[PDB]
Amino acid sequence: MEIIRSNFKSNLHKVYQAIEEADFFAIDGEFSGISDGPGFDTPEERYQKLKKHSMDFLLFQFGLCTFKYDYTDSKYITKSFNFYVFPKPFNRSSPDVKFVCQSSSIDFLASQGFDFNKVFRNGIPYLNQEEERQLRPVTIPEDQKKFIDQVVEKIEDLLQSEENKNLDLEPCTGFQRKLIYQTLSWKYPKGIHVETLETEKKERYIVISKVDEEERKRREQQKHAKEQEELNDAVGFSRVIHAIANSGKLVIGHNMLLDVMHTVHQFYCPLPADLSEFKEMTTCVFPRLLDTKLMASTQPFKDIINNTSLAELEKRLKETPFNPPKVESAEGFPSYQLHEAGYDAYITGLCFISMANYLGSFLSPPKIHVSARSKLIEPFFNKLFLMRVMDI
Amino acid sequence: MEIIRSNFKSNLHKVYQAIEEADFFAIDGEFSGISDGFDTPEERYQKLKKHSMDFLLFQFGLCTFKYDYTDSKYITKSFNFYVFPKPFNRSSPDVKFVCQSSSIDFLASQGFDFNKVFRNGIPYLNQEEERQLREPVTIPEDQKKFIDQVVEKIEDLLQSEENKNLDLEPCTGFQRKLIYQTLSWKYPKGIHVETLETEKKERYIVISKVDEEERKRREQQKHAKEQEELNDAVGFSRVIHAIANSGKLVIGHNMLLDVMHTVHQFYCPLPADLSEFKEMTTCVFPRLLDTKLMASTQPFKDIINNTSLAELEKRLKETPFNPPKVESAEGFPSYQLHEAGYDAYITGLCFISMANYLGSFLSPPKIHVSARSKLIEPFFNKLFLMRVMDI
């Protein structure tokens, strides 16, 4: 499903439900670009370069593929989503976000059909952890006497007459508007609510209305209600990420450092000054990670896999000894060939599954199916590649 | 019209033609952003250069105006060109540009199609980047009968009519060598050896046809497609060159960033001095006018209290101004949401309303003032940097 601004909240339950039911998810990103210019680096030194020359780019498509096993059918049911995100400034005090684009990146996505209007014209907005807290006496001159008598006389033809009527006065001058407001403050102190509405242009007509004192409070706790909505909306796609973090479920990627860096930098909190505290901060968002590149680089998979690119991986993992897992999408959900985050997460998940069930081939007796909760898969958890294999 | 990469070449004749027939042009840019007090023009120029030219101008709006003395009316053609840098292989620069969220959102609210920029935008090259991209026979016994049956198939086609193709069934790289390596002796002219691939990547050999007959009937189309591809990469800069080489008046509104961006992308990366910039600006826009400045100067300053394009296009219809009698040229679209072309088009009508008014001070007062009139010269070649600046 193509989830965008106008259909995000409308789909949020479906996503939540997908996340809650899932045995594991698979994720991917699509970026504005990679680097704005530029071997013996240390992880911390490298981390520092990435933070400087890659974080000014944008993750503007988040691909999430849910995977739920069905032990009756022995098959996985999937649900892939593509979320288009864009930092659409909420208030008039919000930061005006500047980001960078790499022409060859835009060009490649363009070559795959990426719809930039889905990001730039109608992208789901978002806020990070901090941007959320942050965001949380009476004289009437002789020449107006009849004018005001008339108005009071109408207001008495309102307090009596039946129907929840609205008396709306025909346009008058600012002076007369002042004399009217003042005259109603000592003549109808409670039970009447005055307003200055606009027909086409320049607020010139007044609306007087019979307004209960209990209904002043209805409209207020109704206005406050829509206010907590506007806020809780603007956190936007970060709600999805929150839901994944809290799920506790295994999150799968392929060559996923920038996926993760970008995810946490835009939806959680701006990347901290140090690799060490970044690892911690990462165990917040993604307490249970697995990269499929490294898994397909580590034994017993190293012994048979020569290219660990996502592309070659999914080619390889259909042939012996690996079996392509039986998979199908949820009724109602789309199916699958050009590149997009959603599909890449999907392909990523098939790779994982296919490797996982392979580990099971070495048991006695051999298990055709291995869980993501299996402990055979735990050795491959929380290892990311900076300048070498790195624990998280 | 709406002009994009897959649409540009075919319409280039209309664009060059509107440019030649015009009395003057109106241009407007649309950027991916605007920016990431007692400054001097140079100090500011410097600051503008660093903090603004890393944004893209990705839509160029051109509107030509040509007066009809007969029908007493202006006739207009207007264009949006969508422009992105990308083209020509690995040796080419990979541009990194910036985007401002506030600018992008506003353009979104007006129906701007970002796919026309990013998915099918007209490429381009500045002066320098263009200038730059413009610079034996021992056959082993076990293969004897294989090569000989190959020498046959080619002979039984060489002196024979219905001359279409010869497709050798797939062979081993060693034989594939030997076939090539033998036709070096046997048939040194007359034939074209070539290892193609089936849609399934498998290597075929082909001899097919002739030598010295289409050895330059196709080498002509090869080099005419080499020079063709090159001058498609220069792309939109050709229209900027066409405009510059014309001399004609180029009208803008609050144009400093339009001009700056135009020459930075389609001519040459802005130089270090403000004074060097003023020189380049004359190459590209020898004759230029800013409706906002014109409107902020007598005899208009005494009558107009707001020189913004929206408020100006309203005031220039009211007395003592007369909206210009105007019409789209036969075959072109007519005119509202914001866009380069329309902002240009409006910029043109503001200029004309103002120019004609100048004529009312004559005796006899003329109702129509030409773009070449002497009354207009005092407003020419003036931009606002931090004060009114001559160019």
PDB file of C-alpha atoms in Angstrom, chain A residues 64-211:
ATOM      1  CA  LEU A  64       8.100  -1.792   5.843  1.00  0.00           C
ATOM      2  CA  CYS A  65       7.206  -5.425   5.167  1.00  0.00           C
ATOM      3  CA  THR A  66       5.422  -7.410   7.879  1.00  0.00           C
ATOM      4  CA  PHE A  67       5.835 -11.198   8.036  1.00  0.00           C
ATOM      5  CA  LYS A  68       3.494 -13.554   9.971  1.00  0.00           C
ATOM      6  CA  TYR A  69       3.977 -17.351   9.833  1.00  0.00           C
ATOM      7  CA  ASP A  70       0.996 -19.732   9.520  1.00  0.00           C
ATOM      8  CA  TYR A  71       1.966 -23.132  10.911  1.00  0.00           C
ATOM      9  CA  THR A  72      -1.107 -24.835   9.393  1.00  0.00           C
ATOM     10  CA  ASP A  73      -0.312 -23.803   5.832  1.00  0.00           C
ATOM     11  CA  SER A  74       3.427 -23.728   6.540  1.00  0.00           C
ATOM     12  CA  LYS A  75       3.591 -20.318   4.798  1.00  0.00           C
ATOM     13  CA  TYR A  76       4.324 -16.614   5.553  1.00  0.00           C
ATOM     14  CA  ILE A  77       1.689 -13.947   5.021  1.00  0.00           C
ATOM     15  CA  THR A  78       3.073 -10.503   4.244  1.00  0.00           C
ATOM     16  CA  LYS A  79       1.983  -6.900   4.189  1.00  0.00           C
ATOM     17  CA  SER A  80       4.297  -4.365   2.555  1.00  0.00           C
ATOM     18  CA  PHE A  81       3.931  -0.562   2.935  1.00  0.00           C
ATOM     19  CA  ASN A  82       5.646   2.498   1.418  1.00  0.00           C
ATOM     20  CA  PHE A  83       5.410   5.658   3.496  1.00  0.00           C
ATOM     21  CA  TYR A  84       6.292   8.955   1.830  1.00  0.00           C
ATOM     22  CA  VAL A  85       7.577  11.430   4.392  1.00  0.00           C
ATOM     23  CA  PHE A  86       8.337  15.105   4.188  1.00  0.00           C
ATOM     24  CA  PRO A  87       9.139  17.637   6.932  1.00  0.00           C
ATOM     25  CA  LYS A  88       6.153  19.825   6.221  1.00  0.00           C
ATOM     26  CA  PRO A  89       6.472  22.687   8.711  1.00  0.00           C
ATOM     27  CA  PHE A  90       3.578  22.561  11.170  1.00  0.00           C
ATOM     28  CA  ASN A  91       3.435  25.990  12.850  1.00  0.00           C
ATOM     29  CA  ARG A  92       4.899  29.434  12.152  1.00  0.00           C
ATOM     30  CA  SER A  93       7.544  28.762  14.839  1.00  0.00           C
ATOM     31  CA  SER A  94       8.655  25.321  13.537  1.00  0.00           C
ATOM     32  CA  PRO A  95      12.102  25.082  11.899  1.00  0.00           C
ATOM     33  CA  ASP A  96      12.208  25.562   8.129  1.00  0.00           C
ATOM     34  CA  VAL A  97      14.037  22.384   7.133  1.00  0.00           C
ATOM     35  CA  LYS A  98      16.714  22.557   4.461  1.00  0.00           C
ATOM     36  CA  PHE A  99      17.948  19.267   2.996  1.00  0.00           C
ATOM     37  CA  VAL A 100      20.318  18.187   0.192  1.00  0.00           C
ATOM     38  CA  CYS A 101      19.778  16.157  -2.985  1.00  0.00           C
ATOM     39  CA  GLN A 102      22.176  14.131  -5.087  1.00  0.00           C
ATOM     40  CA  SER A 103      21.287  14.364  -8.763  1.00  0.00           C
ATOM     41  CA  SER A 104      22.359  10.729  -9.447  1.00  0.00           C
ATOM     42  CA  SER A 105      20.162   9.536  -6.623  1.00  0.00           C
ATOM     43  CA  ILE A 106      17.138  11.478  -7.889  1.00  0.00           C
ATOM     44  CA  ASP A 107      17.973  10.272 -11.372  1.00  0.00           C
ATOM     45  CA  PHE A 108      18.054   6.606 -10.411  1.00  0.00           C
ATOM     46  CA  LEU A 109      14.788   6.799  -8.450  1.00  0.00           C
ATOM     47  CA  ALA A 110      13.288   8.663 -11.404  1.00  0.00           C
ATOM     48  CA  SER A 111      14.411   5.783 -13.608  1.00  0.00           C
ATOM     49  CA  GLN A 112      12.454   3.416 -11.393  1.00  0.00           C
ATOM     50  CA  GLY A 113       9.249   5.544 -11.440  1.00  0.00           C
ATOM     51  CA  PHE A 114       9.499   7.064  -7.999  1.00  0.00           C
ATOM     52  CA  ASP A 115       6.692   9.573  -7.655  1.00  0.00           C
ATOM     53  CA  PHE A 116       8.234  12.699  -6.216  1.00  0.00           C
ATOM     54  CA  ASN A 117       4.840  14.344  -5.951  1.00  0.00           C
ATOM     55  CA  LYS A 118       4.063  11.688  -3.286  1.00  0.00           C
ATOM     56  CA  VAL A 119       6.901  13.113  -1.191  1.00  0.00           C
ATOM     57  CA  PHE A 120       7.009  16.823  -2.083  1.00  0.00           C
ATOM     58  CA  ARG A 121       3.323  17.435  -2.682  1.00  0.00           C
ATOM     59  CA  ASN A 122       1.703  15.039  -0.222  1.00  0.00           C
ATOM     60  CA  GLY A 123       4.179  13.537   2.229  1.00  0.00           C
ATOM     61  CA  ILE A 124       3.372  12.472   5.768  1.00  0.00           C
ATOM     62  CA  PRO A 125       4.943  14.990   8.163  1.00  0.00           C
ATOM     63  CA  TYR A 126       6.748  14.102  11.401  1.00  0.00           C
ATOM     64  CA  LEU A 127       8.485  15.277  14.511  1.00  0.00           C
ATOM     65  CA  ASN A 128      11.269  13.950  16.674  1.00  0.00           C
ATOM     66  CA  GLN A 129      11.151  13.345  20.459  1.00  0.00           C
ATOM     67  CA  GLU A 130      12.200  16.942  21.323  1.00  0.00           C
ATOM     68  CA  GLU A 131      10.175  18.704  18.617  1.00  0.00           C
ATOM     69  CA  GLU A 132       7.192  16.986  20.290  1.00  0.00           C
ATOM     70  CA  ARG A 133       7.869  18.195  23.869  1.00  0.00           C
ATOM     71  CA  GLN A 134       8.769  21.677  22.566  1.00  0.00           C
ATOM     72  CA  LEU A 135       5.393  21.811  20.766  1.00  0.00           C
ATOM     73  CA  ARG A 136       3.698  21.195  24.143  1.00  0.00           C
ATOM     74  CA  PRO A 137     -18.519  52.619  31.523  1.00  0.00           C
ATOM     75  CA  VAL A 138     -21.518  53.090  29.126  1.00  0.00           C
ATOM     76  CA  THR A 139     -22.528  56.136  26.996  1.00  0.00           C
ATOM     77  CA  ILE A 140     -24.305  56.210  23.634  1.00  0.00           C
ATOM     78  CA  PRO A 141     -24.224  59.415  21.587  1.00  0.00           C
ATOM     79  CA  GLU A 142     -27.489  61.032  20.475  1.00  0.00           C
ATOM     80  CA  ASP A 143     -26.907  60.092  16.848  1.00  0.00           C
ATOM     81  CA  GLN A 144     -26.676  56.340  17.460  1.00  0.00           C
ATOM     82  CA  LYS A 145     -29.471  55.961  20.061  1.00  0.00           C
ATOM     83  CA  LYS A 146     -32.067  54.494  17.659  1.00  0.00           C
ATOM     84  CA  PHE A 147     -29.461  52.355  15.986  1.00  0.00           C
ATOM     85  CA  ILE A 148     -28.696  50.614  19.313  1.00  0.00           C
ATOM     86  CA  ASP A 149     -32.332  50.500  20.501  1.00  0.00           C
ATOM     87  CA  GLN A 150     -33.139  48.527  17.318  1.00  0.00           C
ATOM     88  CA  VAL A 151     -30.321  46.045  17.965  1.00  0.00           C
ATOM     89  CA  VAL A 152     -31.415  45.455  21.596  1.00  0.00           C
ATOM     90  CA  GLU A 153     -35.000  45.163  20.366  1.00  0.00           C
ATOM     91  CA  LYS A 154     -33.829  42.399  17.975  1.00  0.00           C
ATOM     92  CA  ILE A 155     -31.974  40.645  20.778  1.00  0.00           C
ATOM     93  CA  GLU A 156     -35.242  40.544  22.728  1.00  0.00           C
ATOM     94  CA  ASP A 157     -36.902  39.121  19.586  1.00  0.00           C
ATOM     95  CA  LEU A 158     -34.184  36.438  19.941  1.00  0.00           C
ATOM     96  CA  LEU A 159     -34.384  35.656  23.695  1.00  0.00           C
ATOM     97  CA  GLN A 160     -38.146  35.090  23.377  1.00  0.00           C
ATOM     98  CA  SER A 161     -38.666  33.534  19.942  1.00  0.00           C
ATOM     99  CA  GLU A 162     -38.412  29.770  19.571  1.00  0.00           C
ATOM    100  CA  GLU A 163     -35.810  27.917  17.456  1.00  0.00           C
ATOM    101  CA  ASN A 164     -32.080  28.023  18.355  1.00  0.00           C
ATOM    102  CA  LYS A 165     -32.051  31.123  16.162  1.00  0.00           C
ATOM    103  CA  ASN A 166     -29.009  33.169  15.201  1.00  0.00           C
ATOM    104  CA  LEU A 167     -29.518  36.904  14.894  1.00  0.00           C
ATOM    105  CA  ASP A 168     -26.888  38.197  12.487  1.00  0.00           C
ATOM    106  CA  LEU A 169     -26.800  41.970  12.163  1.00  0.00           C
ATOM    107  CA  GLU A 170     -26.368  43.672   8.823  1.00  0.00           C
ATOM    108  CA  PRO A 171     -22.913  45.293   8.421  1.00  0.00           C
ATOM    109  CA  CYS A 172     -22.240  48.367  10.506  1.00  0.00           C
ATOM    110  CA  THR A 173     -19.238  50.621  11.123  1.00  0.00           C
ATOM    111  CA  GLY A 174     -16.384  49.792  13.491  1.00  0.00           C
ATOM    112  CA  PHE A 175     -17.812  52.493  15.732  1.00  0.00           C
ATOM    113  CA  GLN A 176     -21.223  50.873  15.767  1.00  0.00           C
ATOM    114  CA  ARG A 177     -19.566  47.499  16.253  1.00  0.00           C
ATOM    115  CA  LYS A 178     -17.804  48.897  19.332  1.00  0.00           C
ATOM    116  CA  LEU A 179     -20.994  50.458  20.655  1.00  0.00           C
ATOM    117  CA  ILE A 180     -22.752  47.125  20.145  1.00  0.00           C
ATOM    118  CA  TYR A 181     -20.122  44.994  21.886  1.00  0.00           C
ATOM    119  CA  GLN A 182     -19.987  47.439  24.804  1.00  0.00           C
ATOM    120  CA  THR A 183     -23.766  47.640  25.043  1.00  0.00           C
ATOM    121  CA  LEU A 184     -24.094  43.821  25.221  1.00  0.00           C
ATOM    122  CA  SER A 185     -21.416  43.502  27.943  1.00  0.00           C
ATOM    123  CA  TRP A 186     -23.612  45.341  30.485  1.00  0.00           C
ATOM    124  CA  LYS A 187     -26.998  44.319  29.002  1.00  0.00           C
ATOM    125  CA  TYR A 188     -26.551  40.596  28.256  1.00  0.00           C
ATOM    126  CA  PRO A 189     -23.519  39.596  30.343  1.00  0.00           C
ATOM    127  CA  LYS A 190     -24.271  35.836  30.290  1.00  0.00           C
ATOM    128  CA  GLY A 191     -26.112  33.582  27.847  1.00  0.00           C
ATOM    129  CA  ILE A 192     -25.209  35.534  24.721  1.00  0.00           C
ATOM    130  CA  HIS A 193     -22.176  35.080  22.476  1.00  0.00           C
ATOM    131  CA  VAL A 194     -21.166  37.719  19.925  1.00  0.00           C
ATOM    132  CA  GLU A 195     -18.895  37.172  16.929  1.00  0.00           C
ATOM    133  CA  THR A 196     -17.619  39.117  13.903  1.00  0.00           C
ATOM    134  CA  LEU A 197     -17.732  36.789  10.896  1.00  0.00           C
ATOM    135  CA  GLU A 198     -16.873  37.424   7.231  1.00  0.00           C
ATOM    136  CA  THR A 199     -19.004  36.837   4.091  1.00  0.00           C
ATOM    137  CA  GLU A 200     -16.453  37.449   1.315  1.00  0.00           C
ATOM    138  CA  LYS A 201     -14.069  40.190   2.541  1.00  0.00           C
ATOM    139  CA  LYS A 202     -13.314  42.522   5.549  1.00  0.00           C
ATOM    140  CA  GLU A 203     -14.900  41.325   8.878  1.00  0.00           C
ATOM    141  CA  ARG A 204     -17.975  43.603   8.928  1.00  0.00           C
ATOM    142  CA  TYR A 205     -21.119  41.649   9.947  1.00  0.00           C
ATOM    143  CA  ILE A 206     -21.906  40.603  13.543  1.00  0.00           C
ATOM    144  CA  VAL A 207     -23.548  37.348  14.726  1.00  0.00           C
ATOM    145  CA  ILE A 208     -25.349  37.238  18.092  1.00  0.00           C
ATOM    146  CA  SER A 209     -26.418  33.793  19.379  1.00  0.00           C
ATOM    147  CA  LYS A 210     -28.210  32.225  22.372  1.00  0.00           C
ATOM    148  CA  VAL A 211     -25.336  30.340  24.017  1.00  0.00           C
TER     149      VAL A 211
END
